[PDB]
Design a protein around this ligand. Sequence first.
Ligand SMILES: O=C(O)[C@@H](CCB(O)O)NCc1c[nH]cn1
Ligand SMILES: *[C@@H]1O[C@H](CO)[C@@H](O)[C@H](O)[C@H]1NC(C)=O
Ligand SMILES: *[C@@H]1O[C@H](CO)[C@@H](O)[C@H](O)[C@H]1NC(C)=O
Ligand SMILES: *[C@@H]1O[C@H](CO)[C@@H](O)[C@H](O)[C@H]1NC(C)=O
Ligand SMILES: *[C@@H]1O[C@H](CO)[C@@H](O)[C@H](O)[C@H]1NC(C)=O
Ligand SMILES: *[C@@H]1O[C@H](CO)[C@@H](O)[C@H](O)[C@H]1NC(C)=O
Ligand SMILES: [Cl-]
Lengths: 189, 343
Amino acid sequence: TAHLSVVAEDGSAVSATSTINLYFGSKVRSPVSGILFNNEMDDFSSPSITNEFGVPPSPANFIQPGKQPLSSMCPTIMVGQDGQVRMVVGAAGGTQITTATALAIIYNLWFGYDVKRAVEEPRLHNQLLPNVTTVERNIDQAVTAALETRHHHTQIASTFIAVVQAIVRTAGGWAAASDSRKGGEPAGY
Amino acid sequence: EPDNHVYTRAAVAADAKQCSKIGRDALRDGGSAVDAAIAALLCVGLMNAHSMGIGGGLFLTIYNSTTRKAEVINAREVAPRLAFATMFNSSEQSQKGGLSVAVPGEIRGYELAHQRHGRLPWARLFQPSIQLARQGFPVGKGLAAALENKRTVIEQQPVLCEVFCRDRKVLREGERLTLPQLADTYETLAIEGAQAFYNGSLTAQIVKDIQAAGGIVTAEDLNNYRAELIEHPLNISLGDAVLYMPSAPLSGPVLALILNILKGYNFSRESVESPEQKGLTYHRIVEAFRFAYAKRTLLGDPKFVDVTEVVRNMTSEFFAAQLRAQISDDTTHPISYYKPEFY
Ligand SMILES: O=C(O)[C@@H](CCB(O)O)NCc1c[nH]cn1
Ligand SMILES: *[C@@H]1O[C@H](CO)[C@@H](O)[C@H](O)[C@H]1NC(C)=O
Ligand SMILES: *[C@@H]1O[C@H](CO)[C@@H](O)[C@H](O)[C@H]1NC(C)=O
Ligand SMILES: *[C@@H]1O[C@H](CO)[C@@H](O)[C@H](O)[C@H]1NC(C)=O
Ligand SMILES: *[C@@H]1O[C@H](CO)[C@@H](O)[C@H](O)[C@H]1NC(C)=O
Ligand SMILES: *[C@@H]1O[C@H](CO)[C@@H](O)[C@H](O)[C@H]1NC(C)=O
Ligand SMILES: [Cl-]
């Protein structure tokens, strides 16, 4: 998955998330077209087995011909009272996309962190199934403590939790950030 | 580094510096948000080939400052006509080989977004990337890790090792990647338009490739694929702002639920200034995740399952209030406490 954000000069915006699902998707690449095929069929539920995330059969998400599998993506545009775009944000990486999106919005809109800190700030993730809270390797360990004393058994991600690209309006203009976890940078004028 | 990334006119935030620039340049050439978006995406499909590209699918949340309206473009993959509920019996099965491929929707997404919002010629959007794909670029950090992560499956796979290895060992950060075949394909797409992919000169090769790998995609799948305009995206309120996000099949409802739950605590700078407050804040945050995830398993493609009421519940203030009221400040709970639902 990849997310990107855009604000054009007229103040129109695009939040866009896109994916082939797993790293290198299905691992099928055409030797003729060079097209790498998605394994998006994996995002469906099966009537038989429980998924790798421990989610038991969920008939709302069973495979049907022509049907779109449930996705974790959530490309988002925050719009002001005035009709001015306030924020453009979304995330990418495994199943941590919705929690990461939430976090960046919380970080900026509520904690008041600037757009590059919203994106760089340590993250954490729980999706109920699996039944574990994963924290990033550099989370504030007071967060870790405060959760375990409330009976969360936490684990530490061995890599990182999601990749967030964001653009926030300030009175200074459009403040933009790309996630160092994946190594992008914004551009603009 | 010679930039603080605060722009007075326009910005592109992407996960490869070069693709941010490609989109920035599209805007400077007079292109719309969408034009820049598409151009950056094509580049993203090269620089982060593991993440996304024309073999996959996407959604676009678009805000138009002229009309002051938002819209979503749904262009996620669909199951082939031949697909069925019991087609897989392990996770491995739905993860590798032809059978795990859904019908790509990327290009129809780009097309539909471009017809509605494009201002640059179609071919102009492909130009930088074709250039990039033939030229070659150094492997950036993100993709080097992906390669490392998957070195076993890549190195033992000749068709993947062709572009992704040097001397039959995965490319490492800084080494030059070139995507010759994708440049051809991108060029065909630039000239012949979206049609070439779906019902055109690439179309048989796509079927032949998927099916030779054990898949069941057929030309008819491709001919029938349509991206979808969604005139009224999901929305929630946050303060005096409004967030637009996609409905099912995406996680718009989950994110709406998560945030609607958490807005009730009136978070501020204060919530993290003492570890006591910061502790409880993060606990509540995780609880909101768990409550919203519980309801998620009720979701699916709204064309095939009536999730009207589920979605209305998930994005509603009453429902959110109802779940916040059950969050314990002193403790997390068993899975069942959240009332996960599968009907
Ligand atoms: O939910 C979706 O639309 C894509 C997102 C994958 B991406 O690489 O982040 N697939 C989710 C997923 C992640 N791991 C297994 N399935
Ligand atoms: C798995 O088993 C089902 C049900 O018996 C069958 O229809 C399907 O072809 C099998 N799929 C795979 C991928 O082996
Ligand atoms: C907004 O809508 C107009 C029609 O009113 C359309 O031509 C255009 O695609 C949109 N504007 C932008 C900047 O994308
Ligand atoms: C907000 O909520 C729902 C989306 O389904 C709909 O009733 C309404 O059109 C939405 N409003 C906007 C401005 O999109
Ligand atoms: C929506 O509202 C209430 C939860 O407060 C519940 O009784 C009802 O079953 C919900 N509807 C659906 C479709 O989940
Ligand atoms: C899940 O995790 C929580 C917190 O670690 C724990 O209290 C609970 O017993 C675990 N198991 C289930 C089935 O909920
Ligand atoms: Cl290639």
